[PDB]
C-alpha cells in the first residue's frame, strides 16, 4: 500500500493578539488500531505557534483532560511566571493565559507538559507542540520558507502499544532506571509516511520528541545534511554532516538535497544507549520517505547565516555545580527487569565498559541532583538575573544518558561530556549531553523566576525527571 503523507502541523499565528490553546482527550490510529490521544487543538501533537522577535501575544490555553497538566514552552526565554514548569497547574475544566514578549533571536522552540511526576505519561499519551520563532535577520536569508512544502517540521517519537492498541506507560522500576521506549516510530504522530518536496532544497526542522530515546538522523543514500540551526537558532555558517546526533527535546534545522526524482528515507542510525539499542532500532531505521515531485521551490544555502559572538573570559564568573546520580538500588534492580523483559537482547549495543559499570526503597525519589530528589518546595539555588554563570554538570559515577535541559536561557556550551562541541552544537543550545563525564554550559538568565514560579534545571529523559533528576531554582 502507499505509505501515508506526513502530517503537517497548523501554523497558528495571533488573532486581538491572542492565540487559542485546547488540551483534550480525543482517539488516532496507529497501525490499523484505534488509541485514546491527547491533543493540543486536535487529538495527537499540537499546532506550530509563530511568534515574533519583539511582538507580544497572549495565549489562551483550556484544560479539558480530567487531571490536571501545566504548558512549558522549551527553549523559550521568558519568566519564570509562564514558564509553564510543575508549579503551572492548570486545573481540569481550568483556563491559564499567558502574555509571551518574545525577545530571542528565530528559533524552532517545542511546548509540552511538565506535570510533577506525570511528564512523561503526559507526553506518551501525545501532547507536544511547536514554536516558530522569527525575527527580521532570518527572514532576509531567502532559506526553504514554504510551510509544509519544503520547509517542514519533523517531530520523530517511539511509543509501545499494548494488545487492545492502548498506548502501554508506565513509570516502574525499569522505566525510572533505563527510560520509557517502544518499538513503533512515529513521525508527525504517522508511522513511516511519505513527504512530496520539490526539487532543490528541502529543510526539515527536526525534533527529538521522544521520552528517553536518542536519534541520529541520516539519509538512507547518505547524502550530507547541512545544519543551519540548532535549539536556540541559526548556526552561523552551515554545518556538512553525514549522521546528526539529537537528544531528546533538542532541535536541527537541516537542509537536504532533493536533486533527481528518486525517493530515498531520512533514517535513525542505531545509538549505542541501553534499551534504546534493542531492536527493531538495533539497523538504520526509516523515519519517512522523501518524494521528490516537481512544483514552486526558490528555497537557497547561504555561505553566511548569522553572527555568533565570541564567548567571554570565563575569570569571576560563579560556578555552580550539578552531580546527577541514581540510587545503585534503580540501577540494580531496573537492570535486572529489563533483562527479565528482553533475555539475551537486553545489553543490544553495548561494549564490555558500559557492562561492566552495572557490576559484572522508593525508585520515585532515587533520581537525584547534588544528593536530592526534585523538591517543589525547595529551590536548590538562587542565581543572578542578566549575568552570566558557569553551571557544571556531571555524570561521573553513573553509565546512564542525561540529556540535561535548563529553563529560562539559550546556553553556549564550554565542554560537552569532557569534549569541546561539534562545530553544530557549538552556537545556541538549552540541552547538553551528560554521559559518564562532565559538562560545562555558559548561562545567562534575562527574566525573573520568584520561588513560586521557579525554573526547572533537570534530566530530559522524562522518566528520570519524574523520579527525582531535576531541581528548581529562582532568578
Ligand atoms: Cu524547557
Ligand atoms: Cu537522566
Same mark, same amino acid.
Given at each position: ?15 486581538? @493578539?491572542? %492565540? ?42 483550556? @484544560?479539558? =483532560? ?22 503551572? %497547574? ?8 499567558? !502574555?509571551? #514578549? ?8 517545542? /511546548? ?11 507526553? *506518551?499519551?501525545?501532547? *507536544? $507542540? ?13 532559506? +526553504?520558507?514554504?510551510?509544509? %512544502? ?25 522505566? *525510572? ?13 504517522? %508511522? ?18 521522544? #521520552? ?19 535549539? $536556540?537558532?541559526? =548556526? ?22 532533493? @536533486? ?7 533514517? !535513525? ?5 541501553? $534499551?534504546?539499542?534493542?531492536?527493531? /532500532? ?29 564567548? +567571554? ?29 528482553? $533475555? ?16 559484572? /526503597?522508593?525508585?520515585?525519589?532515587? #533520581?537525584?541532583? #547534588? ?85 526547572? *534545571? ?18
Amino acid at each position: 500500500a502507499e505509505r501515508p503523507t506526513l502530517p503537517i502541523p497548523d501554523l497558528l499565528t495571533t488573532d486581538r @493578539n491572542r %492565540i487559542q490553546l485546547t488540551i483534550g482527550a480525543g482517539q488516532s490510529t496507529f497501525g490499523g488500531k484505534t488509541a485514546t490521544t491527547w491533543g493540543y487543538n486536535g487529538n495527537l501533537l499540537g499546532p506550530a505557534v509563530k511568534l515574533q522577535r519583539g511582538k507580544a501575544v497572549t495565549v489562551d490555553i483550556y @484544560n479539558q =483532560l480530567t487531571e490536571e497538566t501545566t504548558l512549558h514552552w522549551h527553549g523559550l526565554e521568558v519568566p519564570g511566571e509562564v514558564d509553564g514548569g510543575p508549579q503551572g %497547574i492548570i486545573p481540569p475544566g481550568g483556563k491559564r493565559s499567558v !502574555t509571551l #514578549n518574545v525577545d530571542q533571536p528565530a528559533a524552532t522552540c517545542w /511546548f509540552h507538559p511538565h506535570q510533577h511526576g506525570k511528564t512523561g505519561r503526559q507526553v *506518551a499519551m501525545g501532547l *507536544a $507542540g511547536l514554536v516558530v520563532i522569527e525575527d527580521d535577520e532570518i527572514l532576509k536569508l531567502m532559506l +526553504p520558507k514554504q510551510w509544509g %512544502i519544503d520547509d517542514v517540521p519533523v517531530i520523530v517519537q517511539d511509543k509501545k502499544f499494548s494488545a487492545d492498541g492502548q498506548i502501554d506507560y508506565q513509570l516502574d522500576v525499569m522505566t *525510572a532506571a533505563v527510560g520509557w521506549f517502544g518499538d513503533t516510530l512515529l513521525t508527525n504522530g504517522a %508511522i513511516y509516511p511519505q513527504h512530496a518536496a520539490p526539487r532543490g532544497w528541502l529543510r526539515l526542522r527536526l525534533l527529538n520528541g521522544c #521520552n528517553a530515546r536518542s536519534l541520529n538522523f541520516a539519509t538512507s543514500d547518505n547524502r550530507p545534511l547541512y545544519v543551519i540551526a540548532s535549539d $536556540g537558532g541559526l =548556526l552561523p555558517e552551515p554545518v556538512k554532516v553525514s549522521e546528526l546526533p539529537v537528544l531528546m527535546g533538542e532541535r536541527f534545522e537541516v537542509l537536504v538535497e532533493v @536533486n533527481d526524482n528518486k525517493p530515498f528515507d531520512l533514517v !535513525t542510525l542505531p545509538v549505542s544507549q541501553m $534499551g534504546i539499542a534493542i531492536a527493531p /532500532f538495533d539497523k538504520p531505521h526509516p523515519v519517512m520517505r522523501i518524494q521528490p515531485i516537481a512544483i514552486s521551490a526558490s528555497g537557497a544555502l547561504p555561505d553566511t547565516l548569522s553572527s555568533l559572538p565570541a564567548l +567571554p573570559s570565563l575569570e569571576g564568573l560563579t560556578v555552580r555545580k550539578l552531580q546527577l546520580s541514581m540510587d545503585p538500588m534503580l540501577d540494580m534492580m531496573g537492570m535486572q527487569m529489563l533483562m527479565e523483559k528482553y $533475555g539475551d537482547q537486553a545489553m543490544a549495543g553495548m561494549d564490555h565498559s558500559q557492562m561492566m559499570g552495572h557490576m559484572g /526503597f522508593d525508585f520515585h525519589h532515587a #533520581n537525584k541532583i #547534588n544528593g536530592q530528589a526534585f523538591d517543589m518546595n525547595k529551590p536548590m539555588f538562587a542565581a543572578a538575573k542578566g549575568q552570566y554563570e558557569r553551571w557544571v554538570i556531571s555524570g561521573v559515577g553513573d553509565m546512564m544518558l542525561h540529556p540535561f535541559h535548563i529553563h529560562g536561557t539559550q546556553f553556549r556550551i564550554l565542554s560537552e561530556n569532557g569534549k569541546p562541541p561539534a562545530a553544530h552544537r557549538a552556537g545556541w543550545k538549552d540541552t547538553v549531553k551528560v554521559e559518564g563525564n562532565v559538562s560545562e554550559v555558559l548561562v545567562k538568565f534575562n527574566h525573573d523566576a520568584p520561588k513560586e514560579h521557579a525554573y526547572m *534545571a533537570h534530566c530530559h529523559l522524562l522518566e528520570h525527571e519524574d523520579t527525582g533528576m531535576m531541581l528548581g531554582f529562582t532568578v
